[PDB]
Write a protein that binds this ligand. Structure first.
Ligand SMILES: Nc1nc2c(ncn2[C@@H]2O[C@H](COP(=O)(O)OP(=O)(O)O)[C@@H](O)[C@H]2O)c(=O)[nH]1
Ligand SMILES: [Mg+2]
Length: 166
């Protein structure tokens, strides 16, 4: 069976939780955890052996840090969400990919720069400049929008595909 932890991170307001719960319960949630810090679990068979997928999401309440540090050292998959409408998510990926290298103390994670919220808000982040951002780190690039379940499949699936082959 084996199990994997989807260490998700990427700005606050990109749609990272509504995206996770979507693949699980399947339902566009406007806010199913505006301040909750619980781990989501959903087991399925991704053409393997029923690999349990324990997704991990953040919240933002308080600001002392503690489990986040031990989350980069425990989990391994990095779904770096980034909304392509506000742009602050892109600048947030340029720093969240340094602390992960801090914890593991290495530059070779199964990172995954996924752009969410591409179903609206004029494309502020085209796929060209974004293609050169992830291409430099050797990480896969994808698009996503839980508002219509578009791209959500290529994100989660490609995530377990990078951790497995690794
Ligand atoms: N258009 C669109 N907006 C989204 C999507 N996911 C999240 N959002 C926005 O983020 C809010 C949903 O709350 P939440 O799931 O907590 O967002 P997160 O905390 O940033 O992941 C909504 O008000 C949406 O405007 C998505 O797939 N499409
Ligand atoms: Mg969230």
């Amino acid at each position: 069976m084996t199990e994997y932890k989807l260490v998700v991170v990427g700005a606050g307001g990109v749609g990272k939780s509504a995206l996770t719960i979507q693949l699980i319960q399947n339902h566009f949630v406007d806010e199913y955890d505006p301040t909750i810090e619980d781990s989501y679990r959903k087991q399925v068979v991704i053409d393997g052996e029923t690999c349990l997928l324990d997704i991990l999401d953040t919240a933002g309440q308080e600001e002392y840090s503690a489990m986040r540090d031990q989350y980069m050292r425990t989990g391994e998959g990095f779904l770096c969400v980034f909304a392509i409408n506000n742009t602050k998510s892109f600048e947030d990926i340029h720093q969240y990919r340094e602390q992960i290298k801090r914890v593991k103390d290495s530059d070779d994670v199964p990172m995954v720069l996924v752009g969410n919220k591409c179903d609206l808000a004029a494309r502020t982040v085209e796929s060209r400049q974004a293609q050169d951002l992830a291409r430099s780190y050797g990480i896969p690039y994808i698009e996503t929008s839980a508002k219509t379940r578009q791209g959500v499949e290529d994100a989660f699936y490609t995530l377990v595909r990078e951790i497995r082959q690794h």
